[PDB]
Amino acid sequence: SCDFSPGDLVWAKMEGYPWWPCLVYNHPFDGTFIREKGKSVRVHVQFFDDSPTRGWVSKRLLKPYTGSKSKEAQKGGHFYSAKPEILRAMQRADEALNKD
Ligand SMILES: [Mg+2]
């Protein structure tokens, strides 16, 4: 693969966390990507948590966010969780999506 850009809504997988609805984010000093020689690309993302958490995620552990209604987001789907933080985040993400 994909080509990510600030403002893209994505599911992101971090070790120790469910798939998280996130916003690709330009860090105002360190940029959008970590592109070190030999390493895999990481993307700076903003999680749709109660407040805007930011971190870096392996680009190959991102997938496009396509609404809470998408098959991948519902039960048995790739991205489904029942954790309360995820349900709140999908809501915010759907709002962010419906602008676009
Ligand atoms: Mg919290």
From Swiss-Prot:
PWWP domain sequence ranges: 6-68
Sites of Phosphoserine modification: S5, S51
Post-translational modification: The N-terminus is blocked.
Entry's localization field: Nucleus; Chromosome
Disease: Lynch syndrome 5: A form of Lynch syndrome, an autosomal dominant disease associated with marked increase in cancer susceptibility. It is characterized by a familial predisposition to early-onset colorectal carcinoma (CRC) and extra-colonic tumors of the gastrointestinal, urological and female reproductive tracts. Lynch syndrome is reported to be the most common form of inherited colorectal cancer in the Western world. Clinically, it is often divided into two subgroups. Endometrial cancer: A malignancy of endometrium, the mucous lining of the uterus. Most endometrial cancers are adenocarcinomas, cancers that begin in cells that make and release mucus and other fluids.
Known partners and oligomeric status: Component of the DNA mismatch repair (MMR) complex composed at least of MSH2, MSH3, MSH6, PMS1 and MLH1. Heterodimer consisting of MSH2-MSH6 (MutS alpha). Forms a ternary complex with MutL alpha (MLH1-PMS1). Interacts with MCM9. Part of the BRCA1-associated genome surveillance complex (BASC), which contains BRCA1, MSH2, MSH6, MLH1, ATM, BLM, PMS2 and the RAD50-MRE11-NBS1 protein complex. This association could be a dynamic process changing throughout the cell cycle and within subnuclear domains.
Domain remark from Swiss-Prot or TrEMBL: The PWWP domain specifically recognizes and binds trimethylated 'Lys-36' of histone H3 (H3K36me3).
UniProt record similarity statement: Belongs to the DNA mismatch repair MutS family.
Function: Component of the post-replicative DNA mismatch repair system (MMR). Heterodimerizes with MSH2 to form MutS alpha, which binds to DNA mismatches thereby initiating DNA repair. When bound, MutS alpha bends the DNA helix and shields approximately 20 base pairs, and recognizes single base mismatches and dinucleotide insertion-deletion loops (IDL) in the DNA. After mismatch binding, forms a ternary complex with the MutL alpha heterodimer, which is thought to be responsible for directing the downstream MMR events, including strand discrimination, excision, and resynthesis.
Name the record gives this protein: DNA mismatch repair protein Msh6
Origin species: Homo sapiens
Lineage summary: Eukaryota, Metazoa, Chordata, Craniata, Vertebrata
Gene it is expressed from: MSH6
First and last residues shown, out of full length: 87 to 186 of 1360
